[PDB]
Symmetry: none
Subunit: 80 residues, 2 copies
Protein backbone atom coordinates (compact mmCIF):
# COMPACT_ATOMS: atom_id res chain seq x y z
CA UNK A 1 0.00 0.00 0.00
CA UNK A 2 0.84 3.73 -0.50
CA UNK A 3 1.94 4.45 3.09
CA UNK A 4 4.11 1.34 2.98
CA UNK A 5 5.72 2.14 -0.36
CA UNK A 6 6.48 5.69 0.80
CA UNK A 7 8.25 4.59 3.97
CA UNK A 8 10.18 1.96 2.09
CA UNK A 9 11.48 4.47 -0.41
CA UNK A 10 12.41 6.69 2.53
CA UNK A 11 14.25 3.92 4.38
CA UNK A 12 16.03 2.90 1.19
CA UNK A 13 17.36 6.44 0.85
CA UNK A 14 18.27 6.91 4.50
CA UNK A 15 20.04 3.67 4.87
CA UNK A 16 21.99 4.02 1.63
CA UNK A 17 23.09 7.55 2.66
CA UNK A 18 24.31 6.39 6.11
CA UNK A 19 25.82 3.08 4.95
CA UNK A 20 27.68 4.84 2.18
CA UNK A 21 29.07 7.53 4.57
CA UNK A 22 30.33 4.75 6.74
CA UNK A 23 31.57 2.57 3.87
CA UNK A 24 33.69 5.35 2.39
CA UNK A 25 35.36 5.88 5.81
CA UNK A 26 36.82 2.34 5.53
CA UNK A 27 40.18 5.36 -2.94
CA UNK A 28 41.02 8.93 -3.94
CA UNK A 29 40.78 11.73 -1.30
CA UNK A 30 38.86 14.02 -3.64
CA UNK A 31 36.46 11.12 -4.35
CA UNK A 32 35.97 10.43 -0.60
CA UNK A 33 34.97 14.05 -0.21
CA UNK A 34 32.58 13.90 -3.16
CA UNK A 35 30.71 10.95 -1.49
CA UNK A 36 30.68 12.44 1.95
CA UNK A 37 29.37 15.78 0.79
CA UNK A 38 26.68 14.27 -1.32
CA UNK A 39 25.57 11.93 1.53
CA UNK A 40 25.57 14.89 3.80
CA UNK A 41 23.47 16.94 1.38
CA UNK A 42 20.96 14.11 1.03
CA UNK A 43 20.86 13.74 4.79
CA UNK A 44 20.10 17.40 5.32
CA UNK A 45 17.54 17.22 2.62
CA UNK A 46 15.98 14.18 4.26
CA UNK A 47 15.87 16.00 7.61
CA UNK A 48 13.67 18.70 6.11
CA UNK A 49 11.52 16.36 3.96
CA UNK A 50 10.53 13.62 6.37
CA UNK A 51 7.00 13.57 5.00
CA UNK A 52 7.81 13.90 1.32
CA UNK A 53 6.23 11.65 -1.31
CA UNK A 54 7.66 8.34 -2.53
CA UNK A 55 8.75 9.82 -5.85
CA UNK A 56 10.75 12.55 -4.18
CA UNK A 57 12.70 9.94 -2.18
CA UNK A 58 13.38 7.79 -5.15
CA UNK A 59 14.56 10.79 -7.10
CA UNK A 60 17.05 11.72 -4.39
CA UNK A 61 18.25 8.16 -4.15
CA UNK A 62 19.02 8.10 -7.88
CA UNK A 63 21.07 11.22 -7.51
CA UNK A 64 22.93 9.71 -4.56
CA UNK A 65 23.66 6.37 -6.18
CA UNK A 66 24.88 8.08 -9.41
CA UNK A 67 27.66 9.78 -7.50
CA UNK A 68 28.43 7.11 -4.95
CA UNK A 69 28.06 3.79 -6.74
CA UNK A 70 30.95 4.34 -9.18
CA UNK A 71 33.36 5.57 -6.58
CA UNK A 72 32.71 2.93 -3.93
CA UNK A 73 32.81 -0.01 -6.34
CA UNK A 74 36.02 1.11 -8.05
CA UNK A 75 34.23 0.35 -11.31
CA UNK A 76 35.88 3.15 -13.29
CA UNK A 77 39.30 1.74 -12.84
CA UNK A 78 41.75 -0.67 -14.25
CA UNK A 79 41.78 0.14 -18.01
CA UNK A 80 44.38 2.87 -17.59
CA UNK B 1 44.68 18.80 -21.07
CA UNK B 2 42.07 17.79 -23.61
CA UNK B 3 43.93 14.63 -24.76
CA UNK B 4 44.15 13.34 -21.23
CA UNK B 5 40.50 14.06 -20.42
CA UNK B 6 39.48 12.21 -23.49
CA UNK B 7 41.59 9.18 -22.54
CA UNK B 8 40.37 9.26 -18.95
CA UNK B 9 36.77 9.17 -20.18
CA UNK B 10 37.44 6.31 -22.55
CA UNK B 11 39.25 4.32 -19.86
CA UNK B 12 36.47 4.81 -17.34
CA UNK B 13 33.91 3.55 -19.87
CA UNK B 14 36.05 0.57 -20.72
CA UNK B 15 36.80 -0.21 -17.09
CA UNK B 16 33.12 -0.14 -16.18
CA UNK B 17 31.95 -2.42 -19.00
CA UNK B 18 34.51 -5.11 -18.29
CA UNK B 19 34.35 -4.87 -14.53
CA UNK B 20 30.54 -5.07 -14.40
CA UNK B 21 30.56 -7.93 -16.86
CA UNK B 22 32.91 -9.82 -14.62
CA UNK B 23 30.98 -8.87 -11.46
CA UNK B 24 27.70 -10.34 -12.67
CA UNK B 25 29.33 -13.46 -14.24
CA UNK B 26 30.52 -14.32 -10.74
CA UNK B 27 29.30 -17.75 -9.58
CA UNK B 28 29.11 -16.27 -6.06
CA UNK B 29 26.25 -13.92 -7.14
CA UNK B 30 23.99 -16.93 -8.02
CA UNK B 31 20.55 -16.08 -6.57
CA UNK B 32 21.72 -12.56 -5.55
CA UNK B 33 20.94 -11.16 -9.02
CA UNK B 34 17.85 -12.15 -11.05
CA UNK B 35 18.42 -13.77 -14.44
CA UNK B 36 16.64 -10.86 -16.10
CA UNK B 37 18.88 -8.33 -14.35
CA UNK B 38 21.97 -10.32 -15.25
CA UNK B 39 21.06 -10.72 -18.93
CA UNK B 40 20.29 -7.05 -19.11
CA UNK B 41 23.60 -6.05 -17.60
CA UNK B 42 25.56 -8.42 -19.82
CA UNK B 43 23.85 -7.26 -23.02
CA UNK B 44 24.51 -3.66 -22.28
CA UNK B 45 28.15 -4.44 -21.40
CA UNK B 46 28.55 -6.20 -24.66
CA UNK B 47 26.95 -3.44 -26.63
CA UNK B 48 29.17 -0.89 -25.07
CA UNK B 49 32.27 -2.96 -25.65
CA UNK B 50 31.19 -3.38 -29.24
CA UNK B 51 30.57 0.39 -29.62
CA UNK B 52 33.97 1.08 -28.11
CA UNK B 53 35.73 -1.26 -30.52
CA UNK B 54 34.17 0.83 -33.31
CA UNK B 55 34.82 4.24 -31.67
CA UNK B 56 38.23 4.09 -30.22
CA UNK B 57 39.04 7.61 -31.45
CA UNK B 58 35.68 9.23 -30.51
CA UNK B 59 35.36 12.44 -28.54
CA UNK B 60 35.39 12.71 -24.71
CA UNK B 61 31.75 13.54 -24.49
CA UNK B 62 30.71 10.59 -26.63
CA UNK B 63 32.40 8.28 -24.12
CA UNK B 64 30.62 10.15 -21.38
CA UNK B 65 27.16 9.76 -22.99
CA UNK B 66 27.79 6.09 -23.47
CA UNK B 67 29.01 5.66 -19.89
CA UNK B 68 25.93 7.31 -18.46
CA UNK B 69 23.75 5.00 -20.54
CA UNK B 70 25.58 2.02 -19.00
CA UNK B 71 25.25 3.46 -15.55
CA UNK B 72 21.41 3.91 -15.80
CA UNK B 73 21.18 0.19 -16.44
CA UNK B 74 23.73 -0.86 -13.84
CA UNK B 75 23.03 1.44 -10.94
CA UNK B 76 19.78 -0.13 -9.78
CA UNK B 77 21.53 -3.54 -9.78
CA UNK B 78 24.59 -2.20 -7.96
CA UNK B 79 22.37 -0.49 -5.41
CA UNK B 80 20.27 -3.70 -5.04
CA UNK B 81 23.41 -5.71 -4.27
CA UNK B 82 24.77 -3.13 -1.77
CA UNK B 83 21.32 -3.09 -0.11
CA UNK B 84 20.93 -6.90 0.26
Amino acid sequence: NAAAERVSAKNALESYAFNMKSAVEDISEADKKKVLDKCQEVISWLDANTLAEKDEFEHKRKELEQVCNPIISGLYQGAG
